[PDB]
Write a protein that binds this ligand. Structure first.
Ligand code: NAG
Ligand code: NAG
Lengths: 100, 50
């Protein structure tokens, strides 16, 4: 409960510096699928009836390639916000802060 | 052939996996020489009731 009045206020007298960690995914593993190898397998008897479903195979491959290029775009976008690359300074002399 | 077109632009174009041609062939069967007794069970003089 809060000790609330109509003429009373509370004011801090000190401060505390705090640090927290936030973890977010950026990209996932890129994959590709060879439909003919996964289905028939070193079979001349098969892979002759897959001429009808080659269109579906192409559709799957197109979707997977789109996913992969999207993953590359995400990885580039997250970390490459700034272009100029700055070398770390030699002398620290940051007034006390230790960034080791 | 994979793209089903005559013009290809730039790209990486992950094509189908490579294969190796099995130029030879073998047959392996157990050591059986004597023929089956076809005459014994086909040319039997007597046959049992159903
Ligand atoms: C504020 O907190 C620090 C560390 O907890 C302490 O050294 C300092 O004395 C505090 N300030 C006052 C006015 O008590
Ligand atoms: C096989 O059958 C035929 C007719 O059923 C007969 O003439 C012949 O003698 C038979 N041979 C043997 C080896 O039993």
């Amino acid at each position: 409960s809060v000790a609330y009045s109509n003429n009373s206020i509370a004011i801090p007298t000190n401060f505390t510096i705090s640090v927290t960690t936030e973890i977010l995914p950026v990209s996932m593993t890129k994959t590709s699928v060879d439909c003919t190898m996964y289905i028939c397998g070193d079979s001349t008897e098969c892979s002759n009836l897959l001429l009808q479903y080659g269109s579906f195979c192409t559709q799957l491959n197109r979707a997977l390639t789109g996913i992969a290029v999207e993953q590359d775009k995400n990885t580039q976008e997250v970390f490459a916000q700034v272009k100029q690359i700055y070398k770390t300074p030699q002398i620290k002399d940051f007034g006390g802060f230790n960034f080791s | 052939c994979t793209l089903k077109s005559f013009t290809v632009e730039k790209g990486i174009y992950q094509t189908s996996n490579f294969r190796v041609q099995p130029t030879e062939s073998i047959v392996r069967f157990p050591n059986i020489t004597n023929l089956c007794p076809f005459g014994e069970v086909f040319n039997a003089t007597t046959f049992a009731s159903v």
